[PDB]
Amino acid sequence: LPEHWTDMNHQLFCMVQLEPGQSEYNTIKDKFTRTCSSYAIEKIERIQNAFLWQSYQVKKRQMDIKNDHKNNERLLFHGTDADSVPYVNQHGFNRSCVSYGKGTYFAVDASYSAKDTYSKPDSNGRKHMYVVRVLTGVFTKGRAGLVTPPPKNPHNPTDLFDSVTNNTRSPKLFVVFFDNQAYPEYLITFTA
Amino acid sequence: NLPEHWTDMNHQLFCMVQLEPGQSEYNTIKDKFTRTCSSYAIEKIERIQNAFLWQSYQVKKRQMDIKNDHKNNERLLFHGTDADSVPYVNQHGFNRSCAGKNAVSYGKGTYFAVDASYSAKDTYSKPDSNGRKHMYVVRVLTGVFTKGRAGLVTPPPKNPHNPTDLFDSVTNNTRSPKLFVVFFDNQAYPEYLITFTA
Ligand SMILES: O=c1[nH]c2sccc2c2cc(O)ccc12
C-alpha cells in the first residue's frame, strides 16, 4: 500500500479528503485546472482501495514484463453520475455497466470528462470526476463494436494491444477492455 | 511463485502440458468427467500453465478468502468451448463480453457447470471439423452465492440498502447448484483442457 496513503486502522477501503493547499491537493487540482479553470473545486478525495490497488499493481507488473520496459501508465479523467460513485470507489470501472469499442472510456483532458453527458450534475449542481491510473500500454485506433483491443499482428491473433484510442498520433481518449486496468486514485467534486 | 508441480517453462509465461493416463492427475480429471460423460471418450488432457492468469486469479482468491468468513470460495467446474475460442481462453481466460446467452439465463456472465454432461452438449463444446469437442476444467471463485436472474450484469447485492456489497457469483438453485455465473475477470482459472470425441 503506497507511501502517500494515510493509515487506515486495519481497514481495506477509505476515502480521504485532501487538505487544500498541501502538495498532493495542489498537484491534482493543477491537473484539472489545466483545462477546467472555470469550474470550482469543492473537494478532492484520495481513494484508498487496497484490493483494487493490489489487482491493478499485478496487471502493471505483467504489462511492464510483456511490453519489455515502456511507460505503460497514463493519468486520465473519468466523469460519472453521482449514483455510480459508490460502485466505482469499491469496485472500479466495469465495461458491463461506445464508438471506439465496448470498454471503459478515459479522457486526456478534464474538460472532456466535465461534459454534463459524463459528469451529470446531481440535484445540487455537483459534478464528479475521477483521476485514474490507466494501463494504456501499447495502443491502436479503436472502432465500433470491439470487445477487446485488436491483435498487434493478425498472424498472432491472441497477442493484443493494451488499449485503443480515437487518434494514435494525438490521443484524447483511451478505452480499456479488462477489469483492473484502471485504478480510481482521486475523486473531484466540483461545480460549473 | 508458480506451483511447484508445474513443468519448468524456462522464462516462458505460458505452456500446455499433456498429461499421462495412469498419473493421479490425469485419472482424477478423467473420473470427474466420466461421472456424467461415460458415453464420450477422452483424446487427451492438457494442464494449462498460464503464469499471468494464475497470478491475477490467486490475488482474487486471497482477497475473497480475507473478505469471506472461512468459506470454501473455490469450486472445480466445467466449461464447454468451440475450437475457435481455445487459443484466446488459453492465453486470456474467460471473457464475459464474449459469452453466449445460456438457454436458461441467470445473468450476463461466464457460465460454469458442476456436471461435465452439461458442458458436453454440442451447443457449448461444438464439435470441430475433425469431430473433436473441447471442455475446460476451471477453478472458479464461487464464494458466497445466490440464485441469479436474467437481468444481472454484476452479482446482486447481499442487502438492498447496501448496493455495493455483492454476492461473489450466482447459481440456478442455491439448494442444488448445477451452474455458476461469474461477472468479473480473473474469477476463473482455466486449469485443464479436455479434448474428447463420441
Ligand atoms: O469521462 C468520461 N466518462 C464517461 S461515462 C461513459 C462514457 C464516458 C466517456 C467517454 C469518452 O470518450 C471520454 C470520456 C468519458
mmCIF file of C-alpha atoms and ligand atoms in Angstrom:
data_model
loop_
_atom_site.group_PDB
_atom_site.id
_atom_site.type_symbol
_atom_site.label_atom_id
_atom_site.label_comp_id
_atom_site.label_asym_id
_atom_site.label_seq_id
_atom_site.Cartn_x
_atom_site.Cartn_y
_atom_site.Cartn_z
ATOM 1 C CA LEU A 1 0.000 0.000 0.000
ATOM 2 C CA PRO A 2 1.618 3.288 -1.192
ATOM 3 C CA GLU A 3 3.541 5.873 0.947
ATOM 4 C CA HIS A 4 1.211 8.929 0.322
ATOM 5 C CA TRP A 5 -1.777 6.867 1.651
ATOM 6 C CA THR A 6 -2.606 7.605 5.304
ATOM 7 C CA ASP A 7 -3.171 4.935 7.994
ATOM 8 C CA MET A 8 -6.485 3.005 7.647
ATOM 9 C CA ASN A 9 -6.665 1.426 11.183
ATOM 10 C CA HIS A 10 -6.551 -2.089 9.549
ATOM 11 C CA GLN A 11 -9.481 -1.221 7.124
ATOM 12 C CA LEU A 12 -9.127 -2.173 3.378
ATOM 13 C CA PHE A 13 -11.145 0.807 1.945
ATOM 14 C CA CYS A 14 -11.319 4.500 2.860
ATOM 15 C CA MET A 15 -11.931 7.815 1.075
ATOM 16 C CA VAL A 16 -9.574 10.503 2.471
ATOM 17 C CA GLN A 17 -10.422 14.204 1.911
ATOM 18 C CA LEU A 18 -7.244 16.103 0.922
ATOM 19 C CA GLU A 19 -6.127 19.239 2.792
ATOM 20 C CA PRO A 20 -6.367 22.220 0.370
ATOM 21 C CA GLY A 21 -3.028 23.992 -0.298
ATOM 22 C CA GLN A 22 -0.820 20.963 0.531
ATOM 23 C CA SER A 23 1.328 19.461 -2.276
ATOM 24 C CA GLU A 24 -0.901 16.444 -3.125
ATOM 25 C CA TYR A 25 -4.132 18.522 -3.390
ATOM 26 C CA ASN A 26 -2.322 21.250 -5.387
ATOM 27 C CA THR A 27 -0.886 18.642 -7.850
ATOM 28 C CA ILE A 28 -4.342 17.059 -8.543
ATOM 29 C CA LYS A 29 -6.079 20.478 -8.647
ATOM 30 C CA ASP A 30 -3.488 21.696 -11.237
ATOM 31 C CA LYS A 31 -4.122 18.620 -13.499
ATOM 32 C CA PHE A 32 -7.854 19.549 -13.501
ATOM 33 C CA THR A 33 -7.448 23.370 -13.790
ATOM 34 C CA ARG A 34 -5.161 22.858 -16.869
ATOM 35 C CA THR A 35 -8.467 22.559 -18.877
ATOM 36 C CA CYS A 36 -11.258 23.278 -16.263
ATOM 37 C CA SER A 37 -10.158 26.631 -14.664
ATOM 38 C CA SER A 38 -13.794 27.995 -14.875
ATOM 39 C CA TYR A 39 -15.032 25.125 -12.632
ATOM 40 C CA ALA A 40 -14.971 25.435 -8.789
ATOM 41 C CA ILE A 41 -13.443 22.502 -6.776
ATOM 42 C CA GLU A 42 -15.490 21.695 -3.613
ATOM 43 C CA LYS A 43 -13.189 18.835 -2.518
ATOM 44 C CA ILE A 44 -10.646 16.247 -3.704
ATOM 45 C CA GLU A 45 -10.646 12.772 -2.065
ATOM 46 C CA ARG A 46 -7.874 10.145 -2.212
ATOM 47 C CA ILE A 47 -9.338 6.674 -2.947
ATOM 48 C CA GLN A 48 -7.579 4.049 -0.730
ATOM 49 C CA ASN A 49 -8.916 0.699 -2.053
ATOM 50 C CA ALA A 50 -6.343 -1.982 -1.049
ATOM 51 C CA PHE A 51 -7.926 -4.808 -3.170
ATOM 52 C CA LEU A 52 -8.305 -2.688 -6.375
ATOM 53 C CA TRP A 53 -4.748 -1.370 -5.877
ATOM 54 C CA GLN A 54 -3.305 -4.937 -5.472
ATOM 55 C CA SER A 55 -5.120 -6.200 -8.632
ATOM 56 C CA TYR A 56 -4.053 -3.083 -10.635
ATOM 57 C CA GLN A 57 -0.364 -3.320 -9.496
ATOM 58 C CA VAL A 58 -0.298 -7.015 -10.563
ATOM 59 C CA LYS A 59 -1.571 -6.032 -14.059
ATOM 60 C CA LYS A 60 1.045 -3.204 -14.158
ATOM 61 C CA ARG A 61 3.938 -5.607 -13.275
ATOM 62 C CA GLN A 62 2.614 -8.010 -16.013
ATOM 63 C CA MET A 63 2.320 -5.254 -18.643
ATOM 64 C CA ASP A 64 5.848 -3.970 -17.739
ATOM 65 C CA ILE A 65 7.189 -7.544 -18.452
ATOM 66 C CA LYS A 66 5.001 -8.146 -21.600
ATOM 67 C CA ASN A 67 5.936 -4.781 -23.231
ATOM 68 C CA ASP A 68 9.653 -5.120 -22.160
ATOM 69 C CA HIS A 69 10.086 -1.879 -20.094
ATOM 70 C CA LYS A 70 7.900 1.000 -21.542
ATOM 71 C CA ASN A 71 5.900 3.644 -19.602
ATOM 72 C CA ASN A 72 2.552 1.741 -19.681
ATOM 73 C CA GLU A 73 0.643 4.094 -17.294
ATOM 74 C CA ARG A 74 -1.225 7.395 -18.032
ATOM 75 C CA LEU A 75 -3.182 9.636 -15.610
ATOM 76 C CA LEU A 76 -6.613 10.203 -17.212
ATOM 77 C CA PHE A 77 -10.091 11.510 -16.251
ATOM 78 C CA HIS A 78 -13.480 9.817 -15.992
ATOM 79 C CA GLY A 79 -16.714 11.777 -15.377
ATOM 80 C CA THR A 80 -19.545 9.798 -13.777
ATOM 81 C CA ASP A 81 -23.043 10.348 -12.322
ATOM 82 C CA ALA A 82 -23.339 10.528 -8.501
ATOM 83 C CA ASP A 83 -25.303 7.196 -8.471
ATOM 84 C CA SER A 84 -22.185 5.299 -9.845
ATOM 85 C CA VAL A 85 -19.620 6.852 -7.374
ATOM 86 C CA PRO A 86 -20.100 4.266 -4.537
ATOM 87 C CA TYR A 87 -19.727 1.335 -7.017
ATOM 88 C CA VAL A 88 -16.584 2.824 -8.659
ATOM 89 C CA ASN A 89 -14.962 3.656 -5.263
ATOM 90 C CA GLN A 90 -15.372 -0.005 -4.151
ATOM 91 C CA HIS A 91 -15.231 -1.966 -7.466
ATOM 92 C CA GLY A 92 -13.515 0.333 -10.028
ATOM 93 C CA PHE A 93 -14.562 0.575 -13.674
ATOM 94 C CA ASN A 94 -16.833 -2.095 -15.259
ATOM 95 C CA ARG A 95 -17.327 -2.281 -19.069
ATOM 96 C CA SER A 96 -20.642 -4.175 -18.464
ATOM 97 C CA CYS A 97 -22.308 -1.096 -16.775
ATOM 98 C CA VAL A 98 -19.148 3.215 -27.344
ATOM 99 C CA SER A 99 -17.839 4.487 -30.756
ATOM 100 C CA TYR A 100 -14.306 3.041 -30.166
ATOM 101 C CA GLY A 101 -15.312 -0.270 -28.526
ATOM 102 C CA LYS A 102 -17.227 -1.845 -25.638
ATOM 103 C CA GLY A 103 -14.809 -0.850 -22.846
ATOM 104 C CA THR A 104 -14.367 1.857 -20.189
ATOM 105 C CA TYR A 105 -13.531 5.347 -21.592
ATOM 106 C CA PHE A 106 -10.949 7.755 -20.088
ATOM 107 C CA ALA A 107 -10.191 11.309 -21.268
ATOM 108 C CA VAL A 108 -6.810 13.056 -21.589
ATOM 109 C CA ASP A 109 -8.434 16.458 -20.715
ATOM 110 C CA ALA A 110 -10.643 17.036 -17.621
ATOM 111 C CA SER A 111 -12.682 19.390 -19.909
ATOM 112 C CA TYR A 112 -13.896 16.305 -21.914
ATOM 113 C CA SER A 113 -14.990 14.437 -18.727
ATOM 114 C CA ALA A 114 -16.571 17.723 -17.423
ATOM 115 C CA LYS A 115 -19.353 17.454 -20.103
ATOM 116 C CA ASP A 116 -22.777 17.043 -18.379
ATOM 117 C CA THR A 117 -23.179 13.826 -20.546
ATOM 118 C CA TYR A 118 -20.358 12.188 -18.416
ATOM 119 C CA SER A 119 -20.187 14.121 -15.084
ATOM 120 C CA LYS A 120 -24.019 14.501 -14.773
ATOM 121 C CA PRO A 121 -24.813 17.322 -12.269
ATOM 122 C CA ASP A 122 -26.716 15.912 -9.202
ATOM 123 C CA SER A 123 -29.867 17.604 -7.707
ATOM 124 C CA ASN A 124 -27.414 20.179 -6.090
ATOM 125 C CA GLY A 125 -25.382 21.048 -9.295
ATOM 126 C CA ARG A 126 -22.386 18.983 -8.023
ATOM 127 C CA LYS A 127 -20.408 17.101 -10.721
ATOM 128 C CA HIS A 128 -17.997 14.166 -10.059
ATOM 129 C CA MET A 129 -14.822 13.211 -11.939
ATOM 130 C CA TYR A 130 -12.148 10.610 -11.155
ATOM 131 C CA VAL A 131 -8.427 10.971 -11.750
ATOM 132 C CA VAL A 132 -7.491 7.450 -12.872
ATOM 133 C CA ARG A 133 -4.209 5.498 -13.231
ATOM 134 C CA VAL A 134 -4.790 3.734 -16.595
ATOM 135 C CA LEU A 135 -2.613 0.974 -18.102
ATOM 136 C CA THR A 136 -2.865 2.266 -21.736
ATOM 137 C CA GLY A 137 0.364 0.406 -22.670
ATOM 138 C CA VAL A 138 0.723 -0.081 -26.458
ATOM 139 C CA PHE A 139 -2.359 1.322 -28.227
ATOM 140 C CA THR A 140 -4.010 1.468 -31.663
ATOM 141 C CA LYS A 141 -7.016 3.246 -33.201
ATOM 142 C CA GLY A 142 -10.321 1.768 -31.992
ATOM 143 C CA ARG A 143 -13.619 1.214 -33.857
ATOM 144 C CA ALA A 144 -17.284 0.471 -33.005
ATOM 145 C CA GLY A 145 -18.110 -2.999 -31.708
ATOM 146 C CA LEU A 146 -14.601 -4.097 -30.409
ATOM 147 C CA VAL A 147 -14.947 -6.320 -27.286
ATOM 148 C CA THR A 148 -11.087 -6.457 -26.804
ATOM 149 C CA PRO A 149 -8.266 -4.442 -28.416
ATOM 150 C CA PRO A 150 -7.194 -5.724 -31.859
ATOM 151 C CA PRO A 151 -4.158 -8.040 -32.200
ATOM 152 C CA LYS A 152 -0.710 -6.316 -32.724
ATOM 153 C CA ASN A 153 -0.206 -8.762 -35.666
ATOM 154 C CA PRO A 154 -3.239 -10.702 -37.057
ATOM 155 C CA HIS A 155 -0.756 -13.638 -37.668
ATOM 156 C CA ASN A 156 -0.704 -13.990 -33.793
ATOM 157 C CA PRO A 157 -4.363 -13.173 -33.053
ATOM 158 C CA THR A 158 -4.099 -13.512 -29.188
ATOM 159 C CA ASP A 159 -1.176 -11.009 -28.701
ATOM 160 C CA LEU A 160 -3.324 -7.848 -28.203
ATOM 161 C CA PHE A 161 -2.848 -4.094 -27.996
ATOM 162 C CA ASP A 162 -3.350 -2.933 -24.357
ATOM 163 C CA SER A 163 -5.934 -0.218 -25.220
ATOM 164 C CA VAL A 164 -7.471 1.706 -28.125
ATOM 165 C CA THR A 165 -7.775 5.420 -28.801
ATOM 166 C CA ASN A 166 -9.564 7.872 -31.127
ATOM 167 C CA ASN A 167 -6.226 9.138 -32.617
ATOM 168 C CA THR A 168 -2.835 7.356 -32.200
ATOM 169 C CA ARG A 169 -0.748 10.478 -33.041
ATOM 170 C CA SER A 170 -2.728 12.889 -30.752
ATOM 171 C CA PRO A 171 -4.975 10.845 -28.446
ATOM 172 C CA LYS A 172 -7.816 12.484 -26.449
ATOM 173 C CA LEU A 173 -9.478 9.297 -25.141
ATOM 174 C CA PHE A 174 -8.436 5.737 -24.286
ATOM 175 C CA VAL A 175 -10.608 2.629 -23.965
ATOM 176 C CA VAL A 176 -9.597 -0.390 -21.854
ATOM 177 C CA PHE A 177 -11.443 -3.715 -22.037
ATOM 178 C CA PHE A 178 -10.364 -5.578 -18.874
ATOM 179 C CA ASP A 179 -11.006 -5.203 -15.162
ATOM 180 C CA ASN A 180 -8.093 -3.905 -13.075
ATOM 181 C CA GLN A 181 -6.509 -1.956 -15.988
ATOM 182 C CA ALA A 182 -7.708 1.292 -14.286
ATOM 183 C CA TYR A 183 -7.301 2.418 -10.634
ATOM 184 C CA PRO A 184 -9.508 5.344 -9.487
ATOM 185 C CA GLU A 185 -6.946 7.369 -7.466
ATOM 186 C CA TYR A 186 -8.819 10.676 -6.761
ATOM 187 C CA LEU A 187 -12.450 11.864 -6.852
ATOM 188 C CA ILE A 188 -13.006 15.574 -7.644
ATOM 189 C CA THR A 189 -16.344 17.097 -6.566
ATOM 190 C CA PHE A 190 -16.879 20.367 -8.495
ATOM 191 C CA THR A 191 -19.428 22.866 -9.954
ATOM 192 C CA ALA A 192 -19.686 24.812 -13.267
ATOM 193 C CA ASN B 1 5.947 -18.207 -7.038
ATOM 194 C CA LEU B 2 4.148 -20.544 -9.551
ATOM 195 C CA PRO B 3 3.007 -24.023 -8.329
ATOM 196 C CA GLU B 4 5.998 -26.415 -7.784
ATOM 197 C CA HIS B 5 4.338 -29.353 -9.693
ATOM 198 C CA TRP B 6 4.300 -27.243 -12.944
ATOM 199 C CA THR B 7 6.918 -28.066 -15.631
ATOM 200 C CA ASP B 8 9.860 -25.595 -15.798
ATOM 201 C CA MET B 9 8.852 -23.066 -18.517
ATOM 202 C CA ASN B 10 12.427 -21.673 -18.684
ATOM 203 C CA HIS B 11 11.375 -17.939 -18.583
ATOM 204 C CA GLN B 12 8.221 -18.537 -20.811
ATOM 205 C CA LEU B 13 4.853 -17.248 -19.402
ATOM 206 C CA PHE B 14 2.630 -19.975 -20.950
ATOM 207 C CA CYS B 15 2.660 -23.734 -21.747
ATOM 208 C CA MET B 16 0.133 -26.596 -22.271
ATOM 209 C CA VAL B 17 1.374 -29.870 -20.663
ATOM 210 C CA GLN B 18 -0.003 -33.181 -21.982
ATOM 211 C CA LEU B 19 -0.879 -35.487 -19.056
ATOM 212 C CA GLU B 20 -0.193 -39.260 -18.968
ATOM 213 C CA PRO B 21 -3.013 -41.733 -18.239
ATOM 214 C CA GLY B 22 -2.201 -43.613 -15.006
ATOM 215 C CA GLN B 23 -0.913 -40.380 -13.313
ATOM 216 C CA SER B 24 -3.312 -39.481 -10.392
ATOM 217 C CA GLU B 25 -3.575 -36.001 -12.028
ATOM 218 C CA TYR B 26 -4.954 -37.425 -15.340
ATOM 219 C CA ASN B 27 -7.110 -40.062 -13.588
ATOM 220 C CA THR B 28 -8.878 -37.576 -11.209
ATOM 221 C CA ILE B 29 -9.937 -35.375 -14.185
ATOM 222 C CA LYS B 30 -10.921 -38.389 -16.317
ATOM 223 C CA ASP B 31 -13.023 -39.714 -13.368
ATOM 224 C CA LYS B 32 -14.665 -36.274 -12.725
ATOM 225 C CA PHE B 33 -15.571 -36.156 -16.469
ATOM 226 C CA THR B 34 -16.762 -39.788 -16.810
ATOM 227 C CA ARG B 35 -19.045 -39.464 -13.721
ATOM 228 C CA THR B 36 -21.575 -37.770 -16.127
ATOM 229 C CA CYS B 37 -19.925 -38.227 -19.640
ATOM 230 C CA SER B 38 -19.348 -42.070 -19.763
ATOM 231 C CA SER B 39 -20.638 -42.150 -23.449
ATOM 232 C CA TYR B 40 -17.744 -39.884 -24.694
ATOM 233 C CA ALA B 41 -14.041 -40.841 -24.954
ATOM 234 C CA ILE B 42 -11.115 -38.571 -23.942
ATOM 235 C CA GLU B 43 -8.418 -37.985 -26.585
ATOM 236 C CA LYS B 44 -6.085 -36.062 -24.195
ATOM 237 C CA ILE B 45 -5.984 -33.823 -21.088
ATOM 238 C CA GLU B 46 -3.609 -30.835 -21.064
ATOM 239 C CA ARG B 47 -2.577 -28.881 -17.934
ATOM 240 C CA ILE B 48 -2.771 -25.115 -18.674
ATOM 241 C CA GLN B 49 0.236 -23.241 -17.259
ATOM 242 C CA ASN B 50 -0.534 -19.520 -17.691
ATOM 243 C CA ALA B 51 1.648 -17.515 -15.264
ATOM 244 C CA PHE B 52 -0.199 -14.151 -15.618
ATOM 245 C CA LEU B 53 -3.740 -15.634 -15.395
ATOM 246 C CA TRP B 54 -2.618 -17.691 -12.352
ATOM 247 C CA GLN B 55 -1.152 -14.600 -10.596
ATOM 248 C CA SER B 56 -4.314 -12.481 -11.154
ATOM 249 C CA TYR B 57 -6.637 -15.356 -10.115
ATOM 250 C CA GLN B 58 -4.598 -16.165 -6.936
ATOM 251 C CA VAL B 59 -4.701 -12.457 -5.904
ATOM 252 C CA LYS B 60 -8.528 -12.518 -6.314
ATOM 253 C CA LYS B 61 -8.712 -15.791 -4.328
ATOM 254 C CA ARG B 62 -6.612 -14.342 -1.460
ATOM 255 C CA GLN B 63 -8.931 -11.266 -1.429
ATOM 256 C CA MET B 64 -12.112 -13.411 -1.320
ATOM 257 C CA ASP B 65 -10.521 -15.647 1.392
ATOM 258 C CA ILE B 66 -9.916 -12.466 3.525
ATOM 259 C CA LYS B 67 -13.363 -10.909 2.806
ATOM 260 C CA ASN B 68 -15.393 -14.105 3.420
ATOM 261 C CA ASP B 69 -15.545 -15.861 6.841
ATOM 262 C CA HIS B 70 -13.521 -19.173 6.449
ATOM 263 C CA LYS B 71 -15.670 -20.058 3.353
ATOM 264 C CA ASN B 72 -14.517 -22.577 0.704
ATOM 265 C CA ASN B 73 -14.612 -19.935 -2.042
ATOM 266 C CA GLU B 74 -13.294 -22.190 -4.887
ATOM 267 C CA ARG B 75 -15.107 -24.917 -6.878
ATOM 268 C CA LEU B 76 -13.711 -27.021 -9.722
ATOM 269 C CA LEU B 77 -16.205 -26.685 -12.586
ATOM 270 C CA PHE B 78 -16.546 -27.373 -16.357
ATOM 271 C CA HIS B 79 -16.815 -25.009 -19.355
ATOM 272 C CA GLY B 80 -17.521 -26.217 -22.917
ATOM 273 C CA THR B 81 -15.825 -24.116 -25.659
ATOM 274 C CA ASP B 82 -15.773 -24.065 -29.500
ATOM 275 C CA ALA B 83 -12.335 -24.768 -31.127
ATOM 276 C CA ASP B 84 -12.130 -21.122 -32.405
ATOM 277 C CA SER B 85 -12.161 -19.825 -28.728
ATOM 278 C CA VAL B 86 -9.495 -22.211 -27.286
ATOM 279 C CA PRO B 87 -6.388 -20.093 -28.199
ATOM 280 C CA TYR B 88 -7.961 -16.943 -26.614
ATOM 281 C CA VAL B 89 -9.108 -18.751 -23.384
ATOM 282 C CA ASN B 90 -5.706 -20.496 -23.004
ATOM 283 C CA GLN B 91 -3.949 -17.053 -23.090
ATOM 284 C CA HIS B 92 -6.629 -14.670 -21.673
ATOM 285 C CA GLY B 93 -9.156 -16.809 -19.759
ATOM 286 C CA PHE B 94 -12.928 -16.301 -19.741
ATOM 287 C CA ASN B 95 -14.288 -13.012 -21.055
ATOM 288 C CA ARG B 96 -17.957 -12.264 -20.112
ATOM 289 C CA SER B 97 -18.066 -9.889 -23.132
ATOM 290 C CA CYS B 98 -17.647 -12.989 -25.441
ATOM 291 C CA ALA B 99 -20.175 -15.243 -23.582
ATOM 292 C CA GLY B 100 -23.210 -16.756 -25.370
ATOM 293 C CA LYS B 101 -26.714 -16.292 -23.943
ATOM 294 C CA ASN B 102 -27.468 -19.536 -21.995
ATOM 295 C CA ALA B 103 -30.716 -21.482 -22.765
ATOM 296 C CA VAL B 104 -31.663 -20.693 -19.125
ATOM 297 C CA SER B 105 -30.151 -17.310 -18.229
ATOM 298 C CA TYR B 106 -29.338 -16.406 -14.593
ATOM 299 C CA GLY B 107 -27.381 -13.328 -15.703
ATOM 300 C CA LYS B 108 -24.989 -11.918 -18.331
ATOM 301 C CA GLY B 109 -21.671 -13.538 -17.342
ATOM 302 C CA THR B 110 -19.499 -16.623 -17.889
ATOM 303 C CA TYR B 111 -21.265 -19.935 -17.104
ATOM 304 C CA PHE B 112 -19.568 -22.885 -15.355
ATOM 305 C CA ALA B 113 -21.177 -26.316 -14.903
ATOM 306 C CA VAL B 114 -20.955 -28.739 -11.962
ATOM 307 C CA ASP B 115 -21.547 -31.729 -14.316
ATOM 308 C CA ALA B 116 -19.329 -32.381 -17.395
ATOM 309 C CA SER B 117 -22.557 -33.664 -19.125
ATOM 310 C CA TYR B 118 -23.928 -30.028 -19.265
ATOM 311 C CA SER B 119 -20.705 -28.686 -20.862
ATOM 312 C CA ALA B 120 -20.567 -31.772 -23.231
ATOM 313 C CA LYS B 121 -23.725 -30.536 -25.073
ATOM 314 C CA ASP B 122 -22.904 -29.653 -28.719
ATOM 315 C CA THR B 123 -24.319 -26.127 -28.005
ATOM 316 C CA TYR B 124 -21.304 -25.459 -25.620
ATOM 317 C CA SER B 125 -18.491 -27.855 -26.757
ATOM 318 C CA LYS B 126 -19.191 -27.502 -30.516
ATOM 319 C CA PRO B 127 -17.598 -30.412 -32.453
ATOM 320 C CA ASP B 128 -14.782 -29.056 -34.694
ATOM 321 C CA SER B 129 -14.279 -30.101 -38.381
ATOM 322 C CA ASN B 130 -12.498 -33.317 -37.046
ATOM 323 C CA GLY B 131 -15.307 -34.176 -34.575
ATOM 324 C CA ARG B 132 -13.243 -33.059 -31.539
ATOM 325 C CA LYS B 133 -15.098 -31.416 -28.611
ATOM 326 C CA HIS B 134 -13.282 -29.224 -26.029
ATOM 327 C CA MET B 135 -14.106 -28.672 -22.347
ATOM 328 C CA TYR B 136 -12.103 -26.746 -19.733
ATOM 329 C CA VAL B 137 -11.803 -27.798 -16.077
ATOM 330 C CA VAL B 138 -11.775 -24.482 -14.225
ATOM 331 C CA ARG B 139 -11.001 -23.228 -10.711
ATOM 332 C CA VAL B 140 -13.895 -20.814 -10.089
ATOM 333 C CA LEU B 141 -14.245 -18.355 -7.189
ATOM 334 C CA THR B 142 -17.969 -19.037 -6.464
ATOM 335 C CA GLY B 143 -17.601 -17.543 -2.954
ATOM 336 C CA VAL B 144 -20.980 -16.635 -1.384
ATOM 337 C CA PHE B 145 -23.727 -17.080 -3.980
ATOM 338 C CA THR B 146 -27.481 -16.667 -4.513
ATOM 339 C CA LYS B 147 -29.980 -17.614 -7.245
ATOM 340 C CA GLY B 148 -29.317 -15.403 -10.265
ATOM 341 C CA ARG B 149 -31.750 -13.644 -12.628
ATOM 342 C CA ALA B 150 -31.573 -12.948 -16.387
ATOM 343 C CA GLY B 151 -31.242 -9.133 -15.946
ATOM 344 C CA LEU B 152 -27.915 -9.218 -13.938
ATOM 345 C CA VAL B 153 -24.685 -7.638 -15.342
ATOM 346 C CA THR B 154 -22.992 -7.929 -11.843
ATOM 347 C CA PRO B 155 -23.895 -10.266 -8.939
ATOM 348 C CA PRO B 156 -26.676 -8.724 -6.864
ATOM 349 C CA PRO B 157 -26.148 -7.040 -3.508
ATOM 350 C CA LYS B 158 -26.492 -9.183 -0.349
ATOM 351 C CA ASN B 159 -28.555 -6.331 1.166
ATOM 352 C CA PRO B 160 -30.767 -3.916 -0.847
ATOM 353 C CA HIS B 161 -29.781 -0.968 1.442
ATOM 354 C CA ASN B 162 -26.031 -1.582 0.719
ATOM 355 C CA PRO B 163 -25.903 -1.849 -3.097
ATOM 356 C CA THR B 164 -22.043 -2.154 -3.350
ATOM 357 C CA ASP B 165 -21.618 -5.237 -1.031
ATOM 358 C CA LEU B 166 -22.090 -8.047 -3.605
ATOM 359 C CA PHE B 167 -22.539 -11.785 -3.754
ATOM 360 C CA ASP B 168 -19.419 -13.348 -5.395
ATOM 361 C CA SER B 169 -21.415 -15.357 -8.002
ATOM 362 C CA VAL B 170 -24.945 -16.568 -8.813
ATOM 363 C CA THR B 171 -26.378 -20.039 -9.422
ATOM 364 C CA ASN B 172 -29.517 -21.699 -10.913
ATOM 365 C CA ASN B 173 -30.553 -23.124 -7.454
ATOM 366 C CA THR B 174 -28.851 -22.478 -4.014
ATOM 367 C CA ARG B 175 -30.144 -25.825 -2.532
ATOM 368 C CA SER B 176 -28.778 -27.896 -5.509
ATOM 369 C CA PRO B 177 -26.441 -25.737 -7.638
ATOM 370 C CA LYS B 178 -25.681 -27.116 -11.142
ATOM 371 C CA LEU B 179 -24.305 -23.924 -12.738
ATOM 372 C CA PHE B 180 -22.465 -20.818 -11.545
ATOM 373 C CA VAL B 181 -22.173 -17.432 -13.254
ATOM 374 C CA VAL B 182 -19.287 -15.033 -12.617
ATOM 375 C CA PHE B 183 -19.225 -11.419 -13.748
ATOM 376 C CA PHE B 184 -15.537 -10.398 -13.308
ATOM 377 C CA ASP B 185 -12.159 -11.073 -14.947
ATOM 378 C CA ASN B 186 -9.692 -13.340 -13.113
ATOM 379 C CA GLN B 187 -12.512 -15.062 -11.121
ATOM 380 C CA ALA B 188 -11.924 -18.314 -13.104
ATOM 381 C CA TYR B 189 -8.601 -20.008 -13.952
ATOM 382 C CA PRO B 190 -8.642 -22.477 -16.904
ATOM 383 C CA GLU B 191 -6.659 -25.350 -15.320
ATOM 384 C CA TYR B 192 -7.140 -28.297 -17.761
ATOM 385 C CA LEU B 193 -8.339 -28.667 -21.362
ATOM 386 C CA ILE B 194 -10.089 -31.973 -22.154
ATOM 387 C CA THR B 195 -10.174 -32.920 -25.866
ATOM 388 C CA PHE B 196 -12.815 -35.641 -26.440
ATOM 389 C CA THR B 197 -14.892 -37.424 -29.119
ATOM 390 C CA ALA B 198 -18.070 -39.544 -29.479
HETATM 391 O O1 LIG C 1 -15.143 10.845 -18.818
HETATM 392 C C1 LIG C 1 -15.847 10.074 -19.434
HETATM 393 N N1 LIG C 1 -16.875 9.435 -18.771
HETATM 394 C C2 LIG C 1 -17.721 8.612 -19.429
HETATM 395 S S1 LIG C 1 -19.050 7.793 -18.665
HETATM 396 C C3 LIG C 1 -19.318 6.929 -20.128
HETATM 397 C C4 LIG C 1 -18.593 7.392 -21.197
HETATM 398 C C5 LIG C 1 -17.567 8.329 -20.804
HETATM 399 C C6 LIG C 1 -16.508 8.963 -21.556
HETATM 400 C C7 LIG C 1 -16.279 8.738 -22.931
HETATM 401 C C8 LIG C 1 -15.233 9.361 -23.554
HETATM 402 O O2 LIG C 1 -14.990 9.158 -24.883
HETATM 403 C C9 LIG C 1 -14.351 10.202 -22.849
HETATM 404 C C10 LIG C 1 -14.545 10.433 -21.523
HETATM 405 C C11 LIG C 1 -15.623 9.819 -20.846
#
